[PDB]
Amino acid sequence: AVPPSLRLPVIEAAFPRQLHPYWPKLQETTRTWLLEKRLMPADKVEEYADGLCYTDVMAGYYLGAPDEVLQAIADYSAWFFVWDDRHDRDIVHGRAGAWRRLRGLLHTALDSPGDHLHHEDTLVAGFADSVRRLYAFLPATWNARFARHFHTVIEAYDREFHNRTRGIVPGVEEYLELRRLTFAHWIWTDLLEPSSGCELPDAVRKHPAYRRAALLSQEFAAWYNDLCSLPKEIAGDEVHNLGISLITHHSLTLEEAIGEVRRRVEECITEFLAVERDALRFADELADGTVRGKELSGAVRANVGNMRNWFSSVYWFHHESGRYMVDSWDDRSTPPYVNN
Numbered sequence: 008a009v010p011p012s013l014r015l016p017v018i019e020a021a022f023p024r025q026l027h028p029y030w031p032k033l034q035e036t037t038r039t040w041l042l043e044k045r046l047m048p049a050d051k052v053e054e055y056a057d058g059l060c061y062t063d064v065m066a067g068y069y070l071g072a073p074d075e076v077l078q079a080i081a082d083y084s085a086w087f088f089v090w091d092d093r094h095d096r097d098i099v100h101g102r103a104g105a106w107r108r109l110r111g112l113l114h115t116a117l118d119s120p121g122d123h124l125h126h127e128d129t130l131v132a133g134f135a136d137s138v139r140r141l142y143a144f145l146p147a148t149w150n151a152r153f154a155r156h157f158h159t160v161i162e163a164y165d166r167e168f169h170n171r172t173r174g175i176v177p178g179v180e181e182y183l184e185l186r187r188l189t190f191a192h193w194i195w196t197d198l199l200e201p202s203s204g205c206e207l208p209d210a211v212r213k214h215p216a217y218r219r220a221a222l223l224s225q226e227f228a229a230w231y232n233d234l235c236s237l238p239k240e241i242a243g244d245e246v247h248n249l250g251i252s253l254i255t256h257h258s259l260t261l262e263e264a265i266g267e268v269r270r271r272v273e274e275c276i277t278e279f280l281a282v283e284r285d286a287l288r289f290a291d292e293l294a295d296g297t298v299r300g301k302e303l304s305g306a307v308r309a310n311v312g313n314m315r316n317w318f319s320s321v322y323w324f325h326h327e328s329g330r331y332m333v334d335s336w337d338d339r340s341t342p343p344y345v346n347n
């Protein structure tokens with residue numbers, strides 16, 4: 008039963024969940040990967056890994072992905088969560104030096120992952136492994152796009168570092184711009200393409216219907232995370248959250264902020280439903296009877312289909328994952344799955 012302040016009837020009724028058939032194998036392989044890359048201690052992997060549902064949320068997103076593609080995505084995604092934890096700890100413990108070096112190392116590894124497969128920082132080595140594997144599915148032009156997008160993500164994380172250190176809470180739209188980078192909107196959008204086995208030409212993926220559908224899918228995911236992770240983040244002195252920016256700069260109460268974030272989230276759904284029709288019509292138009300046309304049509308259709316899947320997967324993930332179960336922690340400021 009989903010808490011009323013987090014419940015979205017439209018999602019529950021109109022966005023039925025899907026699960027990739029590779030998930031059972033996925034859950035086990037990523038867990039083993041986390042262990043062997045030493046991204047989490049053995050006892051914490053044993054106790055928390057499965058309950059974090061990191062593989063689950065991705066397996067409910069990129070439907071149709073080749074098992075190998077989904078595996079790389081899941082490993083990368085699990086790494087991403089751990090990176091978020093490391094980022095959080097560096098801020099809390101004021102490790103500005105350690106963060107700056109990690110920041111620089113990630114930028115470097117992003118462009119040449121093979122060179123960093125066995126770096127002394129296991130977080131860097133774990134990153135390099137997943138990225139190298141992600142770079143082996145599509146042409147280098149896609150790899151370059153992934154890199155360009157993630158370079159931006161890293162810098163957004165750096166801005167978060169300075170914000171929390173200086174105690175600055177970003178403005179609403181200042182946050183809204185930043186959130187598209189810290190949530191890595193365009194990374195997940197990029198990853199739709201190897202999942203459907205086709206790098207989309209710019210003319211296709213920059214089609215206004217495709218762009219808008221892709222954007223709304225991510226805005227929902229990011230803002231719903233804000234809604235659900237708000238108590239966790241308030242307790243952990245995190246300042247990056249749409250609700251927090253509303254409390255700080257719009258004089259809204261916690262109750263008012265939650266309500267406003269809900270409405271913005273709900274509006275994302277109905278805006279998506281409208282543009283989804285245009286995006287799917289675009290997919291039909293691509294099928295002009297040619298082999299290339301059918302390929303592009305099928306890829307767009309699958310991608311838009313997964314844009315929709317993101318809604319339900321992210322929705323249920325926040326209610327199933329132990330990551331946000333702050334009420335069950337002895338110390339609300341310090342999640343038990345994080346290395347403190």
Ligand SMILES: CC[N+](CC)(CC)Cc1ccccc1
Nearest residue numbers: 084087088091189190191232
């Ligand atoms: C750290 C949060 N995360 C995980 C990869 C990176 C920005 C986004 C996310 C949050 C919740 C569900 C899915 C993805």
Ligand SMILES: [Mg+2]
Nearest residue numbers: 091094189247
């Ligand atoms: Mg974060």
Ligand SMILES: [Mg+2]
Nearest residue numbers: 091092095245
């Ligand atoms: Mg976080």
Ligand SMILES: [Mg+2]
Nearest residue numbers: 232233236240
């Ligand atoms: Mg959050």
